[PDB]
RNA sequence: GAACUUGAGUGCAGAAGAGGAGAGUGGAAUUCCACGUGUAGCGGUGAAAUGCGUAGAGAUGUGGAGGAACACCAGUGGCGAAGGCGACUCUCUGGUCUGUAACUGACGCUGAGGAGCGAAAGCGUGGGGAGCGAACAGGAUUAGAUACCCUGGUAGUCCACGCCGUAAACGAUGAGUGCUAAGUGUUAGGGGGUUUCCGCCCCUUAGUGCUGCAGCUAACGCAUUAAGCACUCCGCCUGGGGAGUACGGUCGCAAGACUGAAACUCAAAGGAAUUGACGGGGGCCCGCACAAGCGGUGGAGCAUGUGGUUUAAUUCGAAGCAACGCG
């Protein structure tokens, strides 16, 4: 079987990265990257906006907060239902991080996903948010489950 | 390995004999089996009679 | 006072561990369900490190810093234990393995699927 | 009737052994007891709970009581007819093996019935009780759980004497004797070829393992420790069930043991091996099978097919995957 790899596109026309083109691909409805990219770039020029600065630092001070080091797996041996955390691996720290903003932006409510999207960057920059709960749940689900590693 | 007793020729081990007895007897005190002493299933028997006997007379540790 | 013996109980249930005094007397004692691990984990290694740990904080604020330390019976978490009373702040100098040996004795409970 | 020494046995000389019976003693550990340390758990489980615990436990140190088994040696090692026998020491005592040559000179083998031994459980009487532990109780599990698991715990396990007289009491292989290739460990001996030795080799016994020729066997396999080739003697079998039952008798305090059918019923029961299939057996591997994700279905509305039911007819066919937007 083997292990098999993916890959992704490097620039975006303005904010030339690559996991912003890879946060294009997440939060794609049935196959529109057009959509996907307009509420990217509205919402980047919104945290340009209403935080003076550049949004590509703010967006990886989210993602900083948001990218969890320890999962928790699963292990059920006997009758135990045992969880056992793992450390990540940092592309599923990336991933995570990235289902994480998408989901819990989505999930927030305000009048246009770049809304939700542009106020989640900015409770994930100053660390307490929706996402960032999960963050921390997850953390504690392996602070709880340490007596196995 | 070799035997101890065919080699000097030394017949009925004399519980006296501590220090003899002390060399065939393990570390913590237990008596060590044959094929770490290489001696004959006869003196190993002669020996742990002897050491058995010496134990009893505090001669000989038990535990340690 | 400077100097006592670590007396260390690690079983498949619990690995409890007393620093007593050379004469035997108990400055501080904490287990692995003291620690609060209720369950299995108990037997885990990680909960003995974590016993030997505030062991090792109770007799540091009782002010004794050279052990003699002694494991006692079956279990896992002997060795993480041993580890955990170095790196707290103690010296472990001597390792006494002594888990209770029956010569012959009485006769064991029955084996278990029975 | 006379002779013989090989078989048998006595004599002498060593050797080894948990061979037995009686008494005495030890060291771990377990439990319990008293006191110090000290604080909140311990115990246990797949998960927990019952139990134990602030009236101070578990841990830990010291002391004491008491019972039972004797780590390491320890070994397809030893002894015993078999059951069986593992601390040590003495008392009494049984057998074996080895070397013969001193003696006897066939004294030998086997043995129904009889007499004895005879694991464990059980029984009687008197002690004993530490651990374990039927029964019994609580907690779990479970649909139930008179179970496995957990926590407790009675008889019993232990000892003295008496009874039982049974085991998958097994080598599932009666005892004796002789003959019939090898290789190889090992236990207790003996002798030899150089060496005073250590030790190597050779040779021979008796016991104990494995692999193996001939031979045997249905096959598995046995094979000088026979399941070979023979002779002697004893015990036992004649399809499966009913049935080791019932009746009778003997023995037993009892439980039961031994002896032991018949009516009736079946055409099989059975052994060993082969091919498969299966396993809540082991190994290896693979697949959108699982996980990692993404989107759904199950909810609503409608489209469509199918079961029932209404029917005059609701035509027939498909029916787990592999029927049901199928013909």
Redesign the interface.
């Known amino acids: 079987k083997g292990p098999v790899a993916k890959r992704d596109v490097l620039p975006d026309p303005i904010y030339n990265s690559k996991l912003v083109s890879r946060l294009i691909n997440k939060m794609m409805i049935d196959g529109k990257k057009g959509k996907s990219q307009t509420i990217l770039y509205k919402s980047f020029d919104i945290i340009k906006e209403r935080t003076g600065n550049d949004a590509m630092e703010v967006f990886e001070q989210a993602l900083k907060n948001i990218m969890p080091v320890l999962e928790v797996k699963a292990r059920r041996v006997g009758g135990?239902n045992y969880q056992v955390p793992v450390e990540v691996r940092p592309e599923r720290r990336t991933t995570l991080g990235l289902r994480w903003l998408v989901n819990y932006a989505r999930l927030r409510g305000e009048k246009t996903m770049e809304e939700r999207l542009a106020n989640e960057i900015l409770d994930a920059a100053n660390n307490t948010g929706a996402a960032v709960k999960k963050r921390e749940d997850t953390h504690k689900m392996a602070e709880a489950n340490?007596?196995?590693? | 390995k070799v035997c101890y007793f065919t080699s000097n020729g030394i017949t009925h081990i004399d519980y006296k004999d501590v220090d003899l007895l002390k060399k065939f007897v393990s570390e913590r005190g237990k008596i060590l089996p044959r094929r770490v002493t290489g001696t004959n299933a006869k003196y190993q028997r002669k020996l742990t009679a002897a050491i058995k006997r010496a134990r009893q007379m505090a001669l000989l540790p038990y535990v340690s | 006072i400077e100097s006592g013996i670590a007396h260390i109980r690690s079983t498949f249930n619990n690995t409890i561990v007393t620093i007593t005094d050379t004469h035997g007397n108990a400055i501080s004692w904490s287990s692995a369900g003291a620690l609060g691990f209720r369950g299995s984990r108990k037997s885990t290694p990680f909960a003995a490190q974590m016993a030997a740990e505030t062991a090792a904080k109770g007799s540091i604020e009782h002010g004794l810093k050279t052990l003699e330390v002694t494991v006692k019976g079956p279990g896992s978490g002997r060795e993480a234990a041993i580890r955990a009373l170095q790196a707290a702040g103690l010296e472990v100098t001597a390792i006494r393995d002594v888990t209770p040996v029956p010569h012959n004795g009485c006769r064991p409970p029955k084996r278990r699927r029975v």
């Open positions: 135990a340490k007596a196995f590693a």
